[PDB]
Design an enzyme around this catalytic site. Structure first.
Site, PDB file in Angstrom:
ATOM      1  N   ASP B  11       0.820  -1.219   0.000  1.00 17.89           N
ATOM      2  CA  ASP B  11       0.000   0.000   0.000  1.00 17.89           C
ATOM      3  C   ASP B  11       0.853   1.268   0.000  1.00 17.89           C
ATOM      4  O   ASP B  11       0.409   2.318   0.475  1.00 17.89           O
ATOM      5  CB  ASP B  11      -0.978   0.034   1.188  1.00 17.89           C
ATOM      6  CG  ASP B  11      -1.837  -1.213   1.274  1.00 17.89           C
ATOM      7  OD1 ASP B  11      -2.153  -1.778   0.212  1.00 17.89           O
ATOM      8  OD2 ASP B  11      -2.181  -1.630   2.397  1.00 17.89           O
ATOM      9  N   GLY B  13       1.935   2.902  -2.670  1.00 18.65           N
ATOM     10  CA  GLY B  13       1.675   3.736  -3.837  1.00 18.65           C
ATOM     11  C   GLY B  13       2.404   3.287  -5.097  1.00 18.65           C
ATOM     12  O   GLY B  13       2.721   4.115  -5.960  1.00 18.65           O
ATOM     13  N   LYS B  14       2.657   1.975  -5.228  1.00 16.59           N
ATOM     14  CA  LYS B  14       3.418   1.461  -6.369  1.00 16.59           C
ATOM     15  C   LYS B  14       2.653   1.642  -7.678  1.00 16.59           C
ATOM     16  O   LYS B  14       3.235   2.026  -8.703  1.00 16.59           O
ATOM     17  CB  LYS B  14       3.759  -0.022  -6.150  1.00 16.59           C
ATOM     18  CG  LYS B  14       4.567  -0.313  -4.879  1.00 16.59           C
ATOM     19  CD  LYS B  14       4.727  -1.815  -4.637  1.00 16.59           C
ATOM     20  CE  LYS B  14       3.387  -2.510  -4.353  1.00 16.59           C
ATOM     21  NZ  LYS B  14       2.673  -1.936  -3.165  1.00 16.59           N
ATOM     22  N   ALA B  37      -3.076  -8.083  -4.318  1.00 16.28           N
ATOM     23  CA  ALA B  37      -2.761  -6.698  -4.621  1.00 16.28           C
ATOM     24  C   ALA B  37      -4.029  -5.977  -5.055  1.00 16.28           C
ATOM     25  O   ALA B  37      -4.947  -6.568  -5.627  1.00 16.28           O
ATOM     26  CB  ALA B  37      -1.702  -6.606  -5.724  1.00 16.28           C
ATOM     27  N   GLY B  38      -4.075  -4.692  -4.771  1.00 12.65           N
ATOM     28  CA  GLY B  38      -5.296  -3.951  -4.955  1.00 12.65           C
ATOM     29  C   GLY B  38      -4.974  -2.503  -4.726  1.00 12.65           C
ATOM     30  O   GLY B  38      -4.687  -2.079  -3.602  1.00 12.65           O
ATOM     31  N   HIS B  39      -4.975  -1.744  -5.807  1.00 12.99           N
ATOM     32  CA  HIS B  39      -4.548  -0.365  -5.757  1.00 12.99           C
ATOM     33  C   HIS B  39      -5.291   0.401  -6.827  1.00 12.99           C
ATOM     34  O   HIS B  39      -5.881  -0.180  -7.744  1.00 12.99           O
ATOM     35  CB  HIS B  39      -3.055  -0.235  -5.998  1.00 12.99           C
ATOM     36  CG  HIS B  39      -2.587  -0.947  -7.223  1.00 12.99           C
ATOM     37  ND1 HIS B  39      -2.687  -2.314  -7.374  1.00 12.99           N
ATOM     38  CD2 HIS B  39      -2.051  -0.479  -8.373  1.00 12.99           C
ATOM     39  CE1 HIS B  39      -2.196  -2.660  -8.552  1.00 12.99           C
ATOM     40  NE2 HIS B  39      -1.806  -1.564  -9.179  1.00 12.99           N
ATOM     41  N   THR B  40      -5.196   1.718  -6.738  1.00 13.10           N
ATOM     42  CA  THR B  40      -5.839   2.589  -7.698  1.00 13.10           C
ATOM     43  C   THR B  40      -4.809   3.409  -8.465  1.00 13.10           C
ATOM     44  O   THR B  40      -3.774   3.823  -7.918  1.00 13.10           O
ATOM     45  CB  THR B  40      -6.827   3.506  -6.995  1.00 13.10           C
ATOM     46  OG1 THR B  40      -6.188   4.092  -5.857  1.00 13.10           O
ATOM     47  CG2 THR B  40      -7.980   2.670  -6.493  1.00 13.10           C
ATOM     48  N   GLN B 214       2.649  -6.123  -2.984  1.00 18.09           N
ATOM     49  CA  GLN B 214       2.865  -6.194  -1.527  1.00 18.09           C
ATOM     50  C   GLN B 214       4.050  -5.286  -1.195  1.00 18.09           C
ATOM     51  O   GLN B 214       4.122  -4.163  -1.715  1.00 18.09           O
ATOM     52  CB  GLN B 214       3.013  -7.647  -1.093  1.00 18.09           C
ATOM     53  CG  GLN B 214       1.722  -8.445  -1.170  1.00 18.09           C
ATOM     54  CD  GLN B 214       1.416  -8.954  -2.558  1.00 18.09           C
ATOM     55  OE1 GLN B 214       2.245  -9.603  -3.193  1.00 18.09           O
ATOM     56  NE2 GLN B 214       0.215  -8.680  -3.028  1.00 18.09           N
ATOM     57  N   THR B 229       3.354 -12.259   3.066  1.00 18.58           N
ATOM     58  CA  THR B 229       2.766 -12.976   1.947  1.00 18.58           C
ATOM     59  C   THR B 229       3.692 -14.129   1.549  1.00 18.58           C
ATOM     60  O   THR B 229       4.835 -14.221   2.004  1.00 18.58           O
ATOM     61  CB  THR B 229       2.476 -12.016   0.780  1.00 18.58           C
ATOM     62  OG1 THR B 229       1.498 -12.598  -0.089  1.00 18.58           O
ATOM     63  CG2 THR B 229       3.739 -11.663  -0.027  1.00 18.58           C
ATOM     64  N   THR B 291      -9.395  -1.218  -1.449  1.00 20.27           N
ATOM     65  CA  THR B 291      -8.963  -1.924  -0.253  1.00 20.27           C
ATOM     66  C   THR B 291     -10.055  -1.804   0.805  1.00 20.27           C
ATOM     67  O   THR B 291     -10.454  -0.690   1.168  1.00 20.27           O
ATOM     68  CB  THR B 291      -7.623  -1.375   0.247  1.00 20.27           C
ATOM     69  OG1 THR B 291      -7.731   0.032   0.505  1.00 20.27           O
ATOM     70  CG2 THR B 291      -6.529  -1.620  -0.797  1.00 20.27           C
ATOM     71  N   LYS B 292     -10.542  -2.950   1.288  1.00 19.45           N
ATOM     72  CA  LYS B 292     -11.707  -3.003   2.166  1.00 19.45           C
ATOM     73  C   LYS B 292     -11.335  -2.901   3.644  1.00 19.45           C
ATOM     74  O   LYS B 292     -11.939  -2.114   4.379  1.00 19.45           O
ATOM     75  CB  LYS B 292     -12.495  -4.293   1.911  1.00 19.45           C
ATOM     76  CG  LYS B 292     -13.583  -4.166   0.852  1.00 19.45           C
ATOM     77  CD  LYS B 292     -14.590  -3.075   1.200  1.00 19.45           C
ATOM     78  CE  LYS B 292     -14.780  -2.107   0.036  1.00 19.45           C
ATOM     79  NZ  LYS B 292     -16.019  -1.297   0.171  1.00 19.45           N
ATOM     80  N   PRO B 294      -9.590  -1.778   7.018  1.00 14.04           N
ATOM     81  CA  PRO B 294      -8.855  -0.573   7.428  1.00 14.04           C
ATOM     82  C   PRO B 294      -7.412  -0.906   7.792  1.00 14.04           C
ATOM     83  O   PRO B 294      -7.115  -1.978   8.327  1.00 14.04           O
ATOM     84  CB  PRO B 294      -9.642  -0.068   8.641  1.00 14.04           C
ATOM     85  CG  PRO B 294     -10.326  -1.290   9.180  1.00 14.04           C
ATOM     86  CD  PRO B 294     -10.631  -2.159   7.989  1.00 14.04           C
ATOM     87  N   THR B 400       1.846  14.100  -4.206  1.00 12.36           N
ATOM     88  CA  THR B 400       1.051  15.010  -3.384  1.00 12.36           C
ATOM     89  C   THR B 400      -0.455  14.792  -3.516  1.00 12.36           C
ATOM     90  O   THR B 400      -1.230  15.602  -2.997  1.00 12.36           O
ATOM     91  CB  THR B 400       1.398  16.471  -3.712  1.00 12.36           C
ATOM     92  OG1 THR B 400       1.065  16.758  -5.076  1.00 12.36           O
ATOM     93  CG2 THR B 400       2.884  16.724  -3.506  1.00 12.36           C
TER      94      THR B 400
HETATM   95  O1  LIG Z   1      -1.478  -5.683  -1.555  1.00 12.09           O
HETATM   96  C1  LIG Z   1      -1.467  -5.763  -0.334  1.00 12.09           C
HETATM   97  N1  LIG Z   1      -1.379  -4.614   0.428  1.00 12.09           N
HETATM   98  C2  LIG Z   1      -1.171  -4.685   1.787  1.00 12.09           C
HETATM   99  N2  LIG Z   1      -1.052  -5.912   2.394  1.00 12.09           N
HETATM  100  C3  LIG Z   1      -1.146  -7.036   1.644  1.00 12.09           C
HETATM  101  C4  LIG Z   1      -1.356  -6.998   0.277  1.00 12.09           C
HETATM  102  N3  LIG Z   1      -1.405  -8.273  -0.185  1.00 12.09           N
HETATM  103  C5  LIG Z   1      -1.226  -9.118   0.860  1.00 12.09           C
HETATM  104  N4  LIG Z   1      -1.075  -8.345   1.984  1.00 12.09           N
HETATM  105  C6  LIG Z   1      -0.842  -8.793   3.349  1.00 12.09           C
HETATM  106  O2  LIG Z   1       0.050  -9.892   3.300  1.00 12.09           O
HETATM  107  C7  LIG Z   1      -0.307 -10.844   4.339  1.00 12.09           C
HETATM  108  C8  LIG Z   1      -0.643 -12.171   3.691  1.00 12.09           C
HETATM  109  O3  LIG Z   1      -1.834 -12.093   2.898  1.00 12.09           O
HETATM  110  P1  LIG Z   1      -1.988 -12.976   1.582  1.00 12.09           P
HETATM  111  O4  LIG Z   1      -1.081 -12.379   0.530  1.00 12.09           O
HETATM  112  O5  LIG Z   1      -3.431 -12.851   1.135  1.00 12.09           O
HETATM  113  O6  LIG Z   1      -1.507 -14.352   1.972  1.00 12.09           O
HETATM  114  C9  LIG Z   1      -1.454 -10.189   5.115  1.00 12.09           C
HETATM  115  O7  LIG Z   1      -0.918  -9.337   6.125  1.00 12.09           O
HETATM  116  C10 LIG Z   1      -2.090  -9.317   4.051  1.00 12.09           C
HETATM  117  O8  LIG Z   1      -2.914  -8.279   4.544  1.00 12.09           O
END
Ligand SMILES: O=c1[nH]cnc2c1ncn2[C@@H]1O[C@H](COP(=O)(O)O)[C@@H](O)[C@H]1O
Ligand SMILES: O=c1[nH]cnc2c1ncn2[C@@H]1O[C@H](COP(=O)(O)O)[C@@H](O)[C@H]1O
Lengths: 410, 410
Positions: B11, B13-14, B37-40, B214, B229, B291-292, B294, B400
């Site tokens: 998270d 900002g990649k 992974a999940g980003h905008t 990640q 991960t 990202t759902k 918090p 910014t």
């Molecule tokens: O893209 C991400 N952003 C932030 N944390 C992540 C992301 N992908 C996996 N994680 C974290 O990596 C750990 C393992 O999650 P998994 O990748 O779903 O096995 C957990 O702490 C997740 O929340």
């Protein structure tokens, strides 16, 4: 940092080359795999069979490192440690390396009944599986009785539904408790944060040699999957899990035998089961000793070699086991593949229907023990020159017998 | 080849940085992870939520590569593909990438009951487990009905003892057959030998950008295990599994937020649960959307940053989400750890009893949307200068706001 990497399917001669050059380094680092590796160092008629012990062990001034991507059979490592004097302060085992449990080898054997990969049945894969599960035990856990007990208890709980299937004993729990009671005191003085160690050594400009195990074509991602090991085997793996970054990698020495082997199942385009391959089997299916299963034998495969060189960024090659070819009438080299009438110059992701295209070279009679480029037969140097030119990487080391000093430097 | 890598726990900002610079590259390569992974990307008020789709997708001249160490939810990838026009010839999925099956997410949820890692519950880990087992299915398998059927049948057999434990349906088999009937035709035109592709591009000197997912502290080997991960996340991982060698790595851009987050469980030395951290939670626990869960919030941690920079070989840093700190009274930076009266300057392998040692900086009011170094408040540039100096890597990019063009280059 420099890297010694096998560019075939293992058994290329990495241990001999590391031992030969280790004198010039401050650290020698095994960075992946486990005791599935099995090779000999030979010096002055004394053979040393190493499995997880790094191949700098015969130079007491070297610091040998077992890095974090390794999987450790603690009992077996303790047995290697007992063969050498004063290893304290010159052998360090990463506190992040994962621990092979007896259940792992049993799971390995059980899955092999249906998968028939031809693993070493040492639990390598199942240990890496538990690492991915993040249930695995790591060497650092052994430093705290409470932590180890908590993780063992979780293991016993999780392992319950498998005791029948994997033929775990009735005393599995009690026996594993006693296992660590015996071996944790032995190994704990060697457990260290080797990541910090190597980060600091690299920053200080100290000389680091990274020792690969298995070989490039056994890489879990890029090798001949599923007939691969469960770790990454290339130069980049050395600086994935050591603490060293890719910018730190300088020389990359690709180790290749003058012919090819694999042990276990899987594709092998240049395998030669005809009488032309019988010389290879006599002198080279029994990779010395330390290795029990006979190797499948075949010719050097330049398609696969060029692929492996690209994956590793080899800056030099070592050509090994030339003496094995002494007396052979003719040597073949696979220069391309034929697939359904198409000539392939590039290693494909599926080797189905890839038939070797060969060039034949004159054999030689007496490379064994030669130590000078001048003393080699013309046919040897012609072979070396062809490989270099076709692959585009200079052969800088030539091995003419298992002995440390039977090595030519160019 | 250049690498964009998250140097915290994801998270950072990649995606924004890759999209901002992707115009200068011929290839943009996602090399590990999956749709965890999940980003905008945000440009001109349009938000694009990417998961496995590489962040070069908004430049049609770029070739986007999903590399071999990725794990692919085919259904989810097909859903991302449908959001863009004419992706054929500009998106390629490695025939060696592994396939996430529905059972993987169910196993993930089941193991989480006892392990409580805080995974994304998307089956990432269990897919990597099957890769290590060498039972996993790879994208290339989908190109041959007979091969896919054979591997599915083996999966159904092996999965039988788990149907109750993992709450697999009665129609698991029938449903998975139909799953691939639906999605294999959709994804198969994109499946390619991307290893050969990138080997060739590197040889030809074409411009390659490697996009990490990640972050470094989530690395399976070197992160805060078990709260990590199941893939390797650093720059070296980019050239473990792409076909690129470590010598090919040129610029390594470490992406770090101006503060820290993690989502999920695990150690977090600079976490701030006091009212001083409440500004971070208001503006930065909800990492935009896509990202759902918090995020846990805390301060920049230079001990961890220096560790991550060493692992990656960062040649530059990008400092992200400065606007999130707009209006905060004071910013803390963790400059060292205190552990039982000892000051630690170096990231240890166990963070137990590591208490942050802070330096406090004056906050700022209005960095948001600033596009010129000259227009930033003094307090912003003083913060930037301190980080650079302490870490020893120049900050070359400053973000910014989420918008692509709200980026300062130095
Ligand atoms: O893209 C991400 N952003 C932030 N944390 C992540 C992301 N992908 C996996 N994680 C974290 O990596 C750990 C393992 O999650 P998994 O990748 O779903 O096995 C957990 O702490 C997740 O929340
Ligand atoms: O050191 C080795 N030399 C040659 N082949 C090996 C070595 N270690 C593992 N392999 C092969 O790698 C594959 C997987 O075995 P595993 O590493 O025991 O899982 C099998 O083909 C093994 O024979």
């Amino acid at each position: 940092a420099d890297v010694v990497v096998g560019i075939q399917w293992g058994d290329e001669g990495k241990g001999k080359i590391v031992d030969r050059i280790a004198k010039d380094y401050d650290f020698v680092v095994r960075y992946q795999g486990g005791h599935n590796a099995g090779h000999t160092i030979v010096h002055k008629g004394v053979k040393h069979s190493l499995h997880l012990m790094p191949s700098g062990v015969l130079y007491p001034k070297c610091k040998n490192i077992i890095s974090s991507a390794v999987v450790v059979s603690v009992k077996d490592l303790c047995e290697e440690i007992s063969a050498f004097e004063d290893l304290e302060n010159r052998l360090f085992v990463s506190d992040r390396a994962h621990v092979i449990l007896p259940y792992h080898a049993k799971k390995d054997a059980f899955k092999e009944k249906s998968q028939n990969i031809g693993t070493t049945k040492k639990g390598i894969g199942p240990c890496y599986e538990d690492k991915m599960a993040r249930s695995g035990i790591r060497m650092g856990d052994l430093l705290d009785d409470k932590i180890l007990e908590e993780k063992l208890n979780a293991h016993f709980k999780a392992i319950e539904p498998f005791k029948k299937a994997y033929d775990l004993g009735e005393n599995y729990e009690k026996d594993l408790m006693g296992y660590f009671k015996t071996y944790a005191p032995k190994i704990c003085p060697f457990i260290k944060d080797t990541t910090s160690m190597l980060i600091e050594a690299n920053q200080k400009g100290e000389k680091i040699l990274l020792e690969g195990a298995q070989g490039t074509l056994l890489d879990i991602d890029l090798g001949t999957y599923p007939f691969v090991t469960s770790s990454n085997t290339t130069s980049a793996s050395a600086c994935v899990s050591t603490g060293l970054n890719p910018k730190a990698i300088n020389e990359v020495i690709g180790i290749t035998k003058a012919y090819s082997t694999r042990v276990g199942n899987g594709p092998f385009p240049s395998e030669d089961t005809t009488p032309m391959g019988d010389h290879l089997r006599t002198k080279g299916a029994e990779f010395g000793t330390t290795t029990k299963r006979p190797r499948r034998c075949g010719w050097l495969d330049l398609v696969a070699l060029k692929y492996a060189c690209a994956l590793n960024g080899c800056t030099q090659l070592a050509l090994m086991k030339l003496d094995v070819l002494d007396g052979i009438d003719a040597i073949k080299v696979c220069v391309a593949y034929e697939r359904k009438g198409e000539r392939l110059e590039i290693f494909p992701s599926d080797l189905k229907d890839c038939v070797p295209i060969y060039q034949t070279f004159k054999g030689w009679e007496k490379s064994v023990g030669v130590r000078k480029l001048d003393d080699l037969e013309p046919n040897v140097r012609e072979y070396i020159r062809f490989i270099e030119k076709e692959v585009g990487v200079k052969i800088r080391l030539i091995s003419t017998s298992p002995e440390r000093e039977d090595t030519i430097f160019l």
